[PDB]
């Protein structure tokens, strides 16, 4: 398609997978991960690798996959074995980080963050709704501010 938008009404606000380096932040590199790791979304630590949330029992949410500004242009995706190979999966696991939320989400500040623990394109998306489909609580994480469409900056109190 020609481009996403000819003219934007207002500057789009801080895409997902971003950590603000003012507050105490920590983004920890994980050497092995899953192909197609959709950045800007909650990623679990399973069998010693970072991977997309799916219908697991109690996934160890390792944080939010960081968005690389100087990565491959395209869908925000961690991809192995290509010209756009990503060697290591930067995962934001402490501080304020932006995460894509569902379209149904209207999460006010300090609501507990829930991630869609489903095996689909909605995997690892934050939400307010504790009763959404495949919603799984994220321990000590709360919504903070509303960034660009469907992207909420959340706060991870402890290390995720």
């Amino acid at each position: 398609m020609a481009f996403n938008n000819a003219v934007l009404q207002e500057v789009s606000d801080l895409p997902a997978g971003e950590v603000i380096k003012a507050s105490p932040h920590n983004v920890s590199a994980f050497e092995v991960f899953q192909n197609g790791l959709i950045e800007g979304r909650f990623v679990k630590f399973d069998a010693g690798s970072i991977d997309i949330l799916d219908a697991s029992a109690t996934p160890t949410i390792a944080g939010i996959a960081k968005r690389k500004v100087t990565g491959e242009i395209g869908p925000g995706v961690y991809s192995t074995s290509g010209i756009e190979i990503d060697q290591v999966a930067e995962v934001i696991n402490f501080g304020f980080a932006t995460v894509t939320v569902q379209d149904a989400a209207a999460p006010s500040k300090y609501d507990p963050v829930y991630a869609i623990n489903l095996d689909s394109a909605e995997a690892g998306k934050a939400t307010e709704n504790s009763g959404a489909t495949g919603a799984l609580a994220v321990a000590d994480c709360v919504f903070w501010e509303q960034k660009a469409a469907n992207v909420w900056l959340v706060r991870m109190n402890k290390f995720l």
Binding site: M1, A2, F3, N4, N5, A6, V7
Partner: protein, 54 residues
């Protein structure tokens, strides 16, 4: 309605029409020609607008 701005629409014709040299197989002349075009490169989805029915 469309924007004739360079940054809105371009007409991409990377290679203009080239004609081959004349081929003479005895008394059978033959000329072939080609051109390479990308067509209308619309750069913005909302750089024009349509009215259907008028």
């Amino acid at each position: 309605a469309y924007s004739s701005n360079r940054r809105a629409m371009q007409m991409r014709i990377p290679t203009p029409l080239n004609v081959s040299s004349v081929d003479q197989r005895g008394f059978k002349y033959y000329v072939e020609s080609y051109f390479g075009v990308a067509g209308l490169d619309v750069i913005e989805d909302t750089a024009g607008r349509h009215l259907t029915g008028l």
